Amino acid sequence: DSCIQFTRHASDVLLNLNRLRSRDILTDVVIVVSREQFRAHKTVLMACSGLFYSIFTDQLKCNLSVINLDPEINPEGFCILLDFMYTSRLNLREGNIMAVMATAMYLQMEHVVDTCRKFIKAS
Amino acid sequence: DSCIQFTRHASDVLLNLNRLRSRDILTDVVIVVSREQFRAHKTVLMACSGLFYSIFTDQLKCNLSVINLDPEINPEGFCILLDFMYTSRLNLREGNIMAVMATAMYLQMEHVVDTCRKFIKAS
């Protein structure tokens, strides 16, 4: 086509979606990780995760307001990944990298799994 | 912070949200423009437009599944802008620039209004 493109549009959209999350605006699901609860937007979860994409395209699970993750999933690892989904920023540290990689593999977030594998290989 | 960043994350998120729109997955509103109907995600509309941001933060309008725009709004201008919201790409042409600018002013999409003003000034 003959379209023009606004370079910062995608980043600005994601920044606004994170603002809606922080104010709990139009969140439509709660992700339960052991004792911890995380509110989010199903569309953003699907856009970032192969696991959530599969869950919310299911004709029955698409209508659930609560999703319980596998009890092996660490709440901190999930929190770091949920923050990454809404910001493009990953808080990867020596003390959390194993829990982050395991959570990213479960959530099917290929690019996060790739950087965790590379950072582990370096050490 | 000490975060790392994935450059393409925001663009990849927007691409997936457009894939959900194209398949009519988790769309939660229909925007009526004269005789024409457009299905979309309230969160994406809010993230792109000052008008939709105001509408869906309203304690009553947040729950509406149908929004009717002002009858002066041109369906083609709206379609071009809805496509821009989900792609960062604007189909700006000599034959549609006046309808696109008027629709962007109504929707409160400042960056689109700015490029339309600049393109009109050049001609």
């Binding site: 023009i4 493109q5 606004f6 | 790409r89 490029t115």
Partner: peptide, 4 residues
């Protein structure tokens, strides 16, 4: 704005 750019030419993509």
């Amino acid at each position: 704005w750019v030419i993509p």
